[PDB]
Design a protein around this ligand. Structure first.
Ligand SMILES: [Ca+2]
Ligand SMILES: [Ca+2]
Ligand SMILES: [Ca+2]
Ligand SMILES: [Ca+2]
Ligand SMILES: [Ca+2]
Ligand SMILES: [Ca+2]
Ligand SMILES: [Ca+2]
Ligand SMILES: [Ca+2]
Ligand SMILES: [Ca+2]
Ligand SMILES: [Ca+2]
Ligand SMILES: [Ca+2]
Ligand SMILES: [Ca+2]
Ligand SMILES: [Ca+2]
Ligand SMILES: [Ca+2]
Ligand SMILES: [Ca+2]
Ligand SMILES: [Ca+2]
Ligand SMILES: [Ca+2]
Ligand SMILES: [Ca+2]
Lengths: 193, 365, 352, 189
């Protein structure tokens, strides 16, 4: 009787997390197996789609990233890896969970942003609503509005993007919105006029 | 002067909270102990609101004060296997910062692990094969389990992988010793011992399918039975008749046929020479199928004393008819002692031999 | 404006097909159907060439070949016909895609110069005896689709006429070979099977062939029983001419005076199968006294099962026994007895 | 003995066009025994994009094609007489449509120059790109509304002064593709 090999990595039992900003051609992990006969062991990848994304070194089973990951496209996928002792091939699927980075700046909608109001428009009048979205996860996808630089006449609610008159106007006397996400380390911001 | 901090992860690591549970986990299973979101959802003067969004089929339930998520599976199971096929769950923990009116979504991803909760099942109740008794040791005699025609297991990966092993059959002790599965992932059965149709024509092989759960205790098993019938093969030649077994053997008692021929009588008066008993043979293979495969039998005089017997005697090759070729003068020839041969005509003669004694009789006997 | 704009009423991209390894100077486009300035961009390898006047497009393959097969693997060529509008100063690219059609310009090839098989002679007719062509160990064809797919046929071998009799390929897509006639180690030990691969070109006239030889060696199997020695074949037969051994016994001598009784020649049998491999597969030989006259020979005679030694068991009074005529059996001890038989004649000698 | 089916479609011989806006074809095969046949597609990506009626050899778009992402594929189809499988690849060419407006790069656009600076002075370069093919990916620049003080090169998006500036008077002050049939445009500031 030949004793068929088995994979020993923790991630078959739980999952493998790979950050979306991992450089192409980097080594995500190395497959680990055991053969009771201490036969030589050969490591591969199974699947049309999987094959493109990942490469596996057959003597050791170092796994390499072949294609750019984007959490905002596909956050996770199943990949089947194989080990063979040359009697038989043994295949096991790992769950792979693309980790999010804050790789996206916010995006304003309705770019023709303009409105005209009477000189007499009283203090506290809401005059306009700006909308921007950010598709990164958590704080990286949560947008705050501010004027750049601040206005004595006009204020914008940081949460809702509502612009209201704070100073009395006078026709005979008389804007850059900055939308930013709230990522801790690498916040990304965008401007509209 | 800015506390936008409430509804922000109080932990490091990527935004997404990711956990794994076993499939069919009990109801009330803690999916997430503590979301670790800055802020207070409870008490006299809360700073946040926590609720669940995209909670498809309400698998997930939240205690907002404890920031703890649970499995809701009263009346159901979380079945990873077909036909439910629930590999993962995604929900959103929505957080409102009451003070500044920010919104943050905390993505929870629950990977549902496969458990070895299904047994292999054989497509058919039982299997049948035939082996010609001449088949060499090592030949593959069955591949009947190929292409989902054997056992399959609805679990995933090693839990659904299948290994085939022949077992000891107390109802047929020699089966597990005449047949074997040298490559167990294939369940192709190879002959381990030479067959003899004369000894045993049917075997009852127990085959046990097992899945490849990592933990050996966790393996599930099924059995089936493969009936194997031996077909009679051309391993034996003729036997002359009559055939009367030597006590304690499979051997006919040797036969000496008898003839007697009057001296000075002509062939036309005497032919055909009657022999006692009648010369005839038969294949020792009692059940070659199909009948087309059954060889003919050739009859001949192999050797003879005296050695001039070819002058006086001819034997028909298909019928064993003996005919005198010229009259015998008993002053010159008192007798003949021949050996007869019967052999198959299929290039595998496996001959049988008998004695033929011929007496020459004097005039006025 | 109206210049560098597409006159042709169709989709923007211009898409054409040519055969691989087309002549240098082949027309890829007759006329693009585009005051203007015209050039070629992303002309990687300088494959295309253009006549601005006619808006005509040529293959440049002088010195080289356009090869769709490995190792060049050119399945298409994309270039850009760039147009400047001389009035306004706009730039328009007209994409050209040339799809390269595979041609059956490659024959199948055998991975080896020779193939070798062994078949035990007891192997039943209908058995698969060879699968060595499986999985790119046989013939492979670098062309694409049918042009690259392989069928296998066994050929009449003038130097071994019965090899196409004895062996056959039911499924030409696999080229697994199947025993079609029963073997006999005594009659032929080696075959030379000629095997031909053809590709599956749509044009019968364009189909291409390779041949290999498959030597098959028959292995000796246990299909025969013992032969006594000596064995002198009867003319025009493979049958040992029958053998009667001889012994003589003095009448009133004891077992211990005589034993072991010398038989002339020595009783000895060997397997008619001269080349069973491995040796551990070779049977032993059981010797026995099968039958005899007179019928009370068991009082007097024992024969050793392995060594065929003959023992007198008690002294012989010639008043009561003048002689014995026994039959000796020799059989394989491996459950396929296939016995041989010999005579043993024993004279009782008178004290005088 | 059995003969294998063969595809007879002409597109196996050159290529198959599908326009990028499709919401397709019919596989044709001949079996010399007149076996009933079953058709399919093979490959993970192909299988995802395309479906095949096994009985009628009808080919179904499962998901929308996108010229801009991929403008050709190679797709492997199968036919079976139930005694085995024959596959052949077709080269698939995607037919482009104008389904994109331009995108302006390098916003914000904003410039203040000395009042003294001359007429004819180029002060700025606007750039927008359009990923459609030929006419549909070729962009023109104009002001909407136009300015009597500033002109913009239609081909190149260089902004020049056409009238002299006086601070006293005023302190501070669109991209289209050329698709014949349905032009698409974007505005910038
Ligand atoms: Ca092993
Ligand atoms: Ca991304
Ligand atoms: Ca972001
Ligand atoms: Ca991201
Ligand atoms: Ca289950
Ligand atoms: Ca399961
Ligand atoms: Ca299982
Ligand atoms: Ca038999
Ligand atoms: Ca027979
Ligand atoms: Ca070529
Ligand atoms: Ca070619
Ligand atoms: Ca070819
Ligand atoms: Ca032999
Ligand atoms: Ca033998
Ligand atoms: Ca057919
Ligand atoms: Ca598109
Ligand atoms: Ca387009
Ligand atoms: Ca466009």
């Amino acid at each position: 009787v030949n004793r068929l090999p088995f994979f020993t990595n923790h991630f078959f039992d739980e999952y493998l997390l790979i950050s979306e900003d991992t450089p192409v051609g980097s080594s995500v992990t190395q497959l680990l197996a055991r053969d009771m006969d201490n036969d030589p062991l050969v490591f591969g990848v199974s699947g049309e789609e999987a094959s493109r994304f990942f490469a596996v070194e057959p003597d050791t089973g170092v796994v390499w990233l072949r294609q750019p990951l984007d959490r905002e496209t596909k956050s996770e996928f199943t990949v089947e890896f194989s080990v063979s002792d040359h009697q038989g091939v043994i295949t096991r699927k790992v769950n792979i969970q693309v980790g999010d980075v804050n790789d996206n700046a916010p995006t304003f909608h309705n770019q023709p942003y303009s409105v005209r109001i009477p000189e007499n428009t009283p203090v506290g009048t809401p005059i306009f609503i700006v909308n921007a979205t950010d598709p990164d996860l958590g704080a990286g996808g949560s947008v705050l509005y501010s004027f750049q630089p601040p206005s004595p006449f006009f204020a914008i609610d940081s949460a809702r993007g509502i612009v209201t008159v704070i100073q009395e106007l006078d026709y005979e006397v008389t804007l850059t919105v900055n939308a930013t996400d709230q990522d801790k380390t690498r916040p990304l911001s965008t401007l509209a006029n | 002067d800015w506390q936008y901090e409430d509804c922000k992860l109080a932990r490091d690591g990527p935004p997404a909270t990711i956990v794994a549970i076993d499939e069919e986990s009990r109801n009330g299973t803690i999916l997430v102990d503590n979301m670790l979101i800055k802020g207070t959802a409870g008490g006299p003067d809360p700073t946040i609101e926590l609720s669940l969004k995209d909670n498809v089929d309400y698998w997930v339930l939240m205690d907002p004060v404890k920031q703890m998520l649970f499995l809701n599976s009263t009346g159901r199971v979380l079945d990873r296997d077909p036909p439910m096929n629930i590999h993962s769950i995604v929900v959103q923990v929505q957080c409102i910062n009451k003070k500044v009116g920010t919104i943050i979504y905390h993505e929870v991803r629950i990977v549902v692990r496969d458990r070895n909760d299904n047994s292999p099942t054989f497509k058919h109740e039982s299997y049948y094969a035939t082996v010609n008794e001449l088949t060499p040791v090592g030949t593959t005699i069955f591949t009947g389990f190929s292409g989902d025609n054997g056992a399959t297991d609805i679990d995933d990966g090693p839990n659904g992988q299948i290994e085939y092993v022949i077992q000891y059959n107390p109802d047929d002790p020699t089966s597990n010793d005449t047949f074997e599965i040298p490559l167990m992932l294939t369940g192709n059965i190879v002959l381990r011992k030479r067959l003899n149709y004369e000894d045993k024509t049917r075997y009852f092989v127990i085959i046990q399918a097992n899945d490849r759960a990592q933990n050996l205790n966790e393996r599930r098993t099924t059995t089936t039975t493969l009936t194997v019938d031996v077909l009679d093969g051309d391993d034996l030649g003729p036997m002359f008749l009559p055939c009367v077994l030597v006590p304690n053997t499979r051997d006919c008692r040797p036969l000496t046929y008898q003839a007697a021929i009057p001296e000075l009588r002509t062939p036309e008066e005497l032919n055909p020479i009657i022999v006692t008993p009648p010369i005839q043979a038969i294949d020792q293979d009692r059940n070659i199928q199909p009948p087309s495969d059954r060889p003919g039998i050739l009859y001949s005089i192999l050797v003879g004393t005296p050695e001039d017997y070819p002058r006086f005697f001819h034997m028909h090759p298909r019928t064993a008819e003996l005919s005198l070729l010229e009259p015998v003068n008993r002053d010159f020839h008192q007798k003949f002692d021949l050996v007869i041969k019967a052999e198959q005509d299929n290039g595998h003669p496996l001959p049988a031999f008998a004695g033929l004694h011929i007496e020459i009789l004097d005039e006025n006997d």
